[PDB]
Coordinates of C-alpha atoms and ligand atoms in Angstrom, one line a residue:
Chain A
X1 CA 155.3 138.7 73.9
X2 CA 154.8 135.2 75.5
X3 CA 154.7 135.5 79.3
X4 CA 156.0 132.9 81.9
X5 CA 154.2 132.5 85.2
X6 CA 156.7 132.3 88.3
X7 CA 157.5 129.0 89.9
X8 CA 159.1 130.9 92.9
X9 CA 160.6 127.8 94.5
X10 CA 162.2 126.3 91.3
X11 CA 163.2 129.9 90.3
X12 CA 165.3 130.2 93.5
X13 CA 167.0 126.9 93.0
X14 CA 167.8 127.6 89.3
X15 CA 169.2 131.0 90.3
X16 CA 171.4 129.5 93.0
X17 CA 172.6 126.8 90.4
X18 CA 173.5 129.8 88.0
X19 CA 175.4 131.3 91.0
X20 CA 172.6 134.0 91.3
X21 CA 173.8 135.6 88.0
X22 CA 170.1 135.8 86.9
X23 CA 166.5 135.8 88.2
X24 CA 164.5 132.9 86.7
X25 CA 160.7 132.4 86.0
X26 CA 161.4 128.8 87.2
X27 CA 160.7 126.9 84.0
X28 CA 162.8 123.6 83.1
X29 CA 164.0 123.4 79.5
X30 CA 161.3 120.9 78.2
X31 CA 158.6 122.9 79.8
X32 CA 160.0 126.1 78.2
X33 CA 159.9 124.3 74.9
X34 CA 156.3 123.4 75.3
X35 CA 155.3 126.9 76.3
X36 CA 157.2 128.5 73.4
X37 CA 156.4 125.8 70.8
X38 CA 153.7 127.8 69.0
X39 CA 155.9 131.0 69.1
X40 CA 158.9 129.0 67.5
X41 CA 156.6 127.5 64.9
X42 CA 155.2 130.9 63.9
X43 CA 158.7 132.5 63.9
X44 CA 159.7 130.6 60.7
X45 CA 157.0 132.5 58.8
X46 CA 158.0 136.1 60.0
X47 CA 159.7 138.5 57.9
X48 CA 163.4 138.8 58.8
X49 CA 162.9 142.3 60.4
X50 CA 160.1 141.1 62.6
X51 CA 162.3 138.0 63.6
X52 CA 165.2 140.2 64.6
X53 CA 162.9 142.6 66.5
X54 CA 161.4 139.7 68.4
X55 CA 164.8 138.2 69.3
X56 CA 165.9 141.6 70.7
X57 CA 162.5 142.0 72.6
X58 CA 162.8 138.6 74.3
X59 CA 166.5 138.9 75.1
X60 CA 165.9 142.2 76.9
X61 CA 163.2 140.8 79.3
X62 CA 164.5 140.3 82.8
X63 CA 163.9 136.6 83.6
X64 CA 166.5 134.1 82.3
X65 CA 164.2 131.9 80.2
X66 CA 163.5 134.9 78.0
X67 CA 167.1 134.8 76.9
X68 CA 166.7 131.1 76.1
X69 CA 163.6 131.8 74.1
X70 CA 165.4 134.6 72.0
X71 CA 168.3 132.3 71.4
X72 CA 165.9 129.4 70.3
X73 CA 164.3 131.9 67.9
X74 CA 167.7 132.4 66.3
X75 CA 168.5 128.6 66.4
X76 CA 165.2 127.5 65.0
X77 CA 165.7 130.0 62.2
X78 CA 169.5 129.3 61.7
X79 CA 169.0 128.3 57.9
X80 CA 167.3 131.7 57.2
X81 CA 170.4 133.9 58.1
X82 CA 172.9 135.3 55.7
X83 CA 176.6 135.8 56.7
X84 CA 176.0 139.4 57.6
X85 CA 173.0 138.7 59.8
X86 CA 175.0 136.0 61.7
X87 CA 177.9 138.5 62.2
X88 CA 175.4 140.9 63.8
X89 CA 174.4 138.4 66.4
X90 CA 177.9 138.5 67.9
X91 CA 176.8 141.6 69.6
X92 CA 174.6 139.4 72.0
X93 CA 177.4 137.1 73.2
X94 CA 178.7 139.6 75.8
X95 CA 175.2 140.7 76.8
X96 CA 173.7 138.9 80.0
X97 CA 176.7 136.6 79.6
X98 CA 177.2 133.4 81.6
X99 CA 178.1 129.8 80.4
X100 CA 174.3 129.1 79.8
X101 CA 173.6 131.9 77.3
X102 CA 177.2 131.8 75.8
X103 CA 177.0 128.1 75.1
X104 CA 173.5 128.5 73.7
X105 CA 174.9 131.3 71.3
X106 CA 177.9 129.1 70.5
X107 CA 175.5 126.3 69.4
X108 CA 173.8 128.8 67.2
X109 CA 177.1 129.9 65.5
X110 CA 178.3 126.3 65.4
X111 CA 175.1 125.2 63.7
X112 CA 175.2 128.0 61.1
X113 CA 178.9 127.0 60.4
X114 CA 178.0 123.3 59.9
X115 CA 175.5 124.5 57.4
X116 CA 178.0 126.9 55.7
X117 CA 181.4 125.1 56.2
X118 CA 183.2 127.5 53.9
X119 CA 182.6 130.3 56.3
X120 CA 184.1 128.3 59.3
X121 CA 187.2 130.5 59.2
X122 CA 185.0 133.7 58.8
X123 CA 183.0 133.0 61.9
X124 CA 186.1 131.7 63.8
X125 CA 187.8 135.0 63.0
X126 CA 184.9 137.0 64.3
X127 CA 185.5 135.7 67.8
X128 CA 189.3 134.8 67.8
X129 CA 191.4 137.2 70.0
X130 CA 188.3 139.1 71.1
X131 CA 188.6 141.4 74.1
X132 CA 185.8 139.7 75.9
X133 CA 186.5 136.1 77.2
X134 CA 182.9 135.0 76.5
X135 CA 183.6 135.8 72.8
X136 CA 186.8 133.8 72.9
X137 CA 184.8 130.9 74.6
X138 CA 182.8 130.9 71.4
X139 CA 185.9 130.7 69.2
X140 CA 187.3 127.8 71.4
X141 CA 184.1 125.8 71.3
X142 CA 182.8 126.8 67.8
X143 CA 183.8 123.4 66.4
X144 CA 182.5 121.1 69.1
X145 CA 180.1 119.3 66.9
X146 CA 182.2 119.5 63.6
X147 CA 183.9 116.0 64.1
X148 CA 186.0 115.2 61.0
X149 CA 185.3 118.7 59.7
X150 CA 187.0 120.4 62.6
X151 CA 189.7 122.9 61.4
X152 CA 192.7 121.8 63.6
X153 CA 194.8 124.8 62.9
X154 CA 192.1 127.1 64.2
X155 CA 191.2 124.9 67.2
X156 CA 195.1 124.8 68.1
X157 CA 195.4 128.6 67.5
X158 CA 192.6 129.4 69.9
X159 CA 194.0 127.1 72.6
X160 CA 197.5 128.6 72.3
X161 CA 196.1 132.1 72.3
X162 CA 194.3 131.3 75.7
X163 CA 197.0 128.7 77.0
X164 CA 197.7 130.4 80.4
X165 CA 194.5 132.5 80.7
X166 CA 193.4 132.2 84.4
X167 CA 189.6 132.6 83.6
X168 CA 187.8 129.4 84.7
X169 CA 185.4 129.5 81.8
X170 CA 188.3 129.7 79.3
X171 CA 190.3 126.8 80.7
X172 CA 187.0 124.8 80.8
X173 CA 186.4 125.6 77.2
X174 CA 189.9 124.4 76.1
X175 CA 189.2 121.3 78.0
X176 CA 185.9 120.7 76.4
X177 CA 187.1 121.4 72.9
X178 CA 189.9 118.8 73.3
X179 CA 187.8 116.1 74.8
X180 CA 185.1 116.6 72.1
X181 CA 187.6 116.5 69.3
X182 CA 189.3 113.5 70.9
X183 CA 186.3 111.4 70.0
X184 CA 187.3 112.0 66.3
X185 CA 191.1 112.4 66.5
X186 CA 192.4 111.1 69.9
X187 CA 196.1 111.1 68.7
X188 CA 196.1 114.8 67.7
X189 CA 194.5 115.7 70.9
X190 CA 196.8 113.5 73.1
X191 CA 199.8 114.9 71.2
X192 CA 198.8 118.5 71.5
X193 CA 198.5 118.1 75.2
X194 CA 202.0 116.7 75.4
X195 CA 203.6 119.5 73.3
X196 CA 201.8 122.5 75.1
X197 CA 201.9 123.4 78.7
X198 CA 198.1 123.5 79.5
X199 CA 196.6 124.2 82.8
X200 CA 195.9 121.2 85.0
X201 CA 192.2 122.0 84.7
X202 CA 192.3 121.9 80.8
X203 CA 194.5 118.9 80.8
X204 CA 192.1 116.9 83.2
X205 CA 189.0 118.1 81.2
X206 CA 190.7 117.5 77.8
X207 CA 191.6 113.8 78.6
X208 CA 188.2 112.4 79.7
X209 CA 187.7 110.0 76.8
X210 CA 191.3 108.8 76.4
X211 CA 192.4 105.3 77.4
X212 CA 195.1 106.8 79.5
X213 CA 194.9 110.4 81.0
Chain B
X1 CA 169.5 130.6 38.0
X2 CA 170.1 126.8 38.0
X3 CA 170.7 125.7 34.4
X4 CA 170.6 122.0 33.6
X5 CA 172.8 120.6 30.7
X6 CA 170.7 118.7 28.1
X7 CA 171.2 115.1 28.1
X8 CA 169.2 113.9 24.9
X9 CA 169.3 110.2 25.4
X10 CA 168.3 110.3 29.0
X11 CA 165.7 113.0 28.3
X12 CA 164.1 110.8 25.6
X13 CA 163.7 107.9 28.3
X14 CA 162.4 110.1 30.9
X15 CA 160.0 111.8 28.5
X16 CA 158.7 108.4 27.2
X17 CA 158.0 107.3 30.8
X18 CA 155.7 110.3 31.3
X19 CA 154.0 109.4 27.9
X20 CA 155.7 112.2 25.8
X21 CA 153.8 115.1 27.2
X22 CA 156.7 117.1 28.9
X23 CA 160.0 118.2 27.6
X24 CA 162.8 116.9 29.7
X25 CA 166.4 118.1 30.2
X26 CA 167.5 114.5 30.9
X27 CA 168.5 114.9 34.7
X28 CA 167.6 112.0 36.9
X29 CA 166.4 112.8 40.4
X30 CA 169.7 111.9 42.3
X31 CA 171.7 114.0 39.9
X32 CA 169.2 116.8 40.0
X33 CA 169.2 116.8 43.8
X34 CA 173.0 117.0 43.9
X35 CA 173.0 119.8 41.3
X36 CA 170.4 121.8 43.1
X37 CA 171.6 121.3 46.7
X38 CA 173.3 124.8 46.9
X39 CA 170.3 126.6 45.4
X40 CA 168.0 124.9 47.9
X41 CA 170.4 125.9 50.7
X42 CA 170.4 129.6 49.8
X43 CA 166.6 129.6 49.3
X44 CA 166.1 129.6 53.1
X45 CA 167.7 133.0 53.1
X46 CA 165.5 134.7 50.5
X47 CA 162.9 137.2 51.4
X48 CA 159.5 135.6 51.2
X49 CA 158.7 137.5 48.1
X50 CA 161.8 136.4 46.3
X51 CA 161.1 132.8 47.3
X52 CA 157.5 132.8 45.8
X53 CA 158.9 134.6 42.7
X54 CA 161.6 131.9 42.2
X55 CA 159.2 129.1 42.8
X56 CA 157.0 130.7 40.1
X57 CA 159.9 131.3 37.7
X58 CA 161.2 127.6 38.0
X59 CA 157.7 126.2 37.6
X60 CA 157.1 128.1 34.3
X61 CA 160.5 127.0 32.7
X62 CA 160.0 124.4 29.9
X63 CA 161.8 121.4 31.1
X64 CA 160.0 119.1 33.6
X65 CA 163.0 119.0 36.1
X66 CA 162.4 122.8 36.7
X67 CA 159.0 121.9 38.0
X68 CA 160.7 119.4 40.4
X69 CA 163.1 122.2 41.4
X70 CA 160.1 124.5 42.1
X71 CA 158.4 121.9 44.4
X72 CA 161.8 121.3 46.2
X73 CA 162.0 125.0 46.9
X74 CA 158.6 124.8 48.4
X75 CA 159.3 121.5 50.2
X76 CA 162.6 122.8 51.7
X77 CA 160.9 126.0 53.0
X78 CA 157.7 124.3 54.2
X79 CA 158.2 125.8 57.8
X80 CA 158.3 129.3 56.3
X81 CA 154.7 129.3 54.9
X82 CA 151.6 130.6 56.7
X83 CA 148.2 129.0 56.1
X84 CA 147.3 131.8 53.6
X85 CA 150.5 131.1 51.5
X86 CA 149.9 127.4 51.6
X87 CA 146.4 127.9 50.3
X88 CA 147.9 129.9 47.4
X89 CA 150.1 126.9 46.4
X90 CA 146.9 125.0 45.6
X91 CA 146.9 126.9 42.3
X92 CA 149.9 124.9 41.2
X93 CA 148.5 121.4 41.6
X94 CA 146.4 121.5 38.3
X95 CA 149.2 123.3 36.4
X96 CA 151.5 121.0 34.2
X97 CA 149.9 118.2 36.2
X98 CA 150.8 114.5 36.0
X99 CA 151.3 112.0 38.8
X100 CA 154.9 113.1 39.2
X101 CA 154.2 116.7 39.9
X102 CA 150.9 116.1 41.8
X103 CA 152.5 113.5 44.1
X104 CA 155.4 115.9 44.7
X105 CA 152.8 118.7 45.6
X106 CA 150.9 116.2 47.7
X107 CA 154.1 115.7 49.7
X108 CA 154.4 119.4 50.3
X109 CA 150.9 119.6 51.6
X110 CA 151.3 116.6 53.7
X111 CA 154.5 117.9 55.3
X112 CA 152.9 121.3 56.0
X113 CA 149.9 119.5 57.6
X114 CA 152.4 117.2 59.6
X115 CA 153.8 120.5 61.0
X116 CA 150.4 122.2 61.6
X117 CA 148.1 119.3 62.4
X118 CA 145.2 121.5 63.6
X119 CA 144.9 122.8 60.0
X120 CA 144.6 119.2 58.5
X121 CA 140.7 119.7 58.1
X122 CA 141.3 123.2 56.5
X123 CA 143.9 121.8 54.0
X124 CA 141.9 118.6 53.3
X125 CA 138.8 120.9 52.5
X126 CA 140.8 122.9 49.8
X127 CA 141.1 119.6 47.7
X128 CA 138.1 117.7 48.8
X129 CA 135.3 117.5 46.0
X130 CA 137.6 119.6 43.6
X131 CA 136.5 119.5 39.9
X132 CA 140.0 118.6 38.8
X133 CA 140.7 114.9 39.8
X134 CA 144.4 115.8 40.3
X135 CA 143.3 118.0 43.2
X136 CA 141.1 115.1 44.6
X137 CA 144.2 112.8 44.3
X138 CA 145.9 115.3 46.9
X139 CA 142.8 115.0 49.2
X140 CA 142.9 111.2 49.0
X141 CA 146.7 111.0 49.7
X142 CA 147.0 114.1 52.0
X143 CA 147.4 111.7 54.9
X144 CA 149.7 108.9 53.5
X145 CA 152.5 109.7 55.9
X146 CA 150.3 110.7 58.9
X147 CA 150.0 107.3 60.6
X148 CA 148.3 107.5 63.8
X149 CA 147.6 111.3 63.2
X150 CA 145.4 110.3 60.3
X151 CA 141.8 111.8 60.4
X152 CA 139.6 108.6 59.6
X153 CA 136.5 110.6 58.8
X154 CA 138.1 112.8 56.2
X155 CA 139.9 109.7 54.7
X156 CA 136.6 107.8 54.5
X157 CA 134.7 110.9 53.1
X158 CA 137.1 111.3 50.3
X159 CA 137.0 107.6 49.4
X160 CA 133.2 107.6 49.5
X161 CA 133.3 110.6 47.1
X162 CA 135.5 109.0 44.4
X163 CA 134.4 105.4 45.1
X164 CA 132.9 104.9 41.6
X165 CA 135.2 107.2 39.7
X166 CA 136.6 105.5 36.6
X167 CA 139.9 107.4 36.6
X168 CA 142.9 105.2 37.1
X169 CA 144.8 107.9 39.0
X170 CA 141.9 108.3 41.4
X171 CA 141.3 104.6 42.1
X172 CA 145.1 104.2 42.5
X173 CA 145.0 107.0 45.0
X174 CA 142.1 105.2 46.9
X175 CA 144.1 102.0 47.0
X176 CA 147.3 103.7 48.2
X177 CA 145.4 105.6 51.0
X178 CA 144.1 102.3 52.3
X179 CA 147.5 100.4 51.9
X180 CA 149.3 103.1 53.9
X181 CA 146.7 103.5 56.6
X182 CA 146.5 99.6 57.1
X183 CA 150.0 99.8 58.4
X184 CA 148.6 101.8 61.4
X185 CA 145.0 100.6 61.7
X186 CA 144.3 97.4 59.8
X187 CA 141.0 96.8 61.6
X188 CA 139.6 100.2 60.4
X189 CA 140.9 99.5 56.9
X190 CA 139.3 96.0 57.0
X191 CA 135.9 97.5 58.1
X192 CA 135.8 100.2 55.5
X193 CA 136.7 97.8 52.7
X194 CA 133.8 95.5 53.7
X195 CA 131.4 98.4 54.1
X196 CA 132.2 99.9 50.7
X197 CA 132.2 98.2 47.3
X198 CA 135.7 99.4 46.0
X199 CA 137.0 99.0 42.5
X200 CA 139.0 95.8 41.8
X201 CA 142.2 98.0 41.6
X202 CA 141.5 99.9 44.9
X203 CA 140.7 96.6 46.6
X204 CA 143.8 94.9 45.4
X205 CA 146.0 97.9 46.5
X206 CA 144.5 98.5 49.8
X207 CA 144.3 95.0 51.1
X208 CA 148.0 94.2 50.6
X209 CA 148.7 94.1 54.3
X210 CA 145.5 92.5 55.5
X211 CA 145.7 88.8 56.6
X212 CA 143.9 86.2 54.5
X213 CA 141.6 83.3 55.8
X214 CA 143.2 80.6 53.4
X215 CA 146.4 81.8 55.4
Ligands
CL1 CL1 167.6 124.4 76.3

């Protein structure tokens, strides 16, 4: 495997930023991309089994950027995965979980769905009602980039399921999903917030792009 | 396996345009692209061996649009090929060759090289000085889309090699290589064209974007 040298100073600041949930090598995203560029390039040519093994191998390394590399390996190869391989990735979402890895997994699941729109409800269903809130954050935010292809019923159903959930990262996810969708359909978003009793946090977060909050 | 519906009237026209040497189904490119979209999408998911076998099976089908399908399969999966796999695709360039398939193959090799720029000399050398002029057409046009990433020496070497070659498809390829590169480096193109005595066709084609003294 690729090996990051430690930038101890930057590493401590990134850790503090991530509320000390993880140790870092201390490597900003653009720099990580430059260091892992040859690896990501080579990854497109690997047999599927080799690719899955390498994603597992990087994910299990201790420093945080190695989870980012593993998730980039999946994202850069998102077109190569079948439905059944994508379903197997769900196993990683709860692993080493914080908003940073989970949102990266969500971008992976979201990108694959945007490639395979007919499986939107299948992937949504994988995460909907999950025991683990990080899994439900994926269901809530699966459609962030779908714009006019957002499935409103599914979005609404996820928000309703988590309406009064106390978890900070869940209320944030509801808010994010609404503000994103409001760039496409401000009326449906504004009306939903009037018809449901949302947390103050979701409501504030959900109304960022509206003319009147 | 994608199957095109035969459109006899459109096929006659497409066939005539390639001088009646291929059988056509009669599926123009925009329609072909819409009809093969889902096959191209699922092709990314195929094991490498299946992908090579499918490319080969489409290439060996009768109608010309299936060769276009084959090259699209390769083009869409360009990132998936190692150097060794790309070298093996050179075997297709002289097969069922005419400007339509060879220029589509050239696009494949140019895209792969755009993705793996350190291998430009290696891919160029596959085609440079080949016996089959269709292969040398690829050498001449490998860099059409490379702009500032173009390797001048290799371009110049290829033009020198075929400078006096009679073949229309070669002189045309020389002119195009100069035309495209002049959008990036008109001085270098100017210098070369004054250094070498190029065919009237190559000279007309390559000097399109150079300023004239009479204004
Ligand atoms: Cl990133």
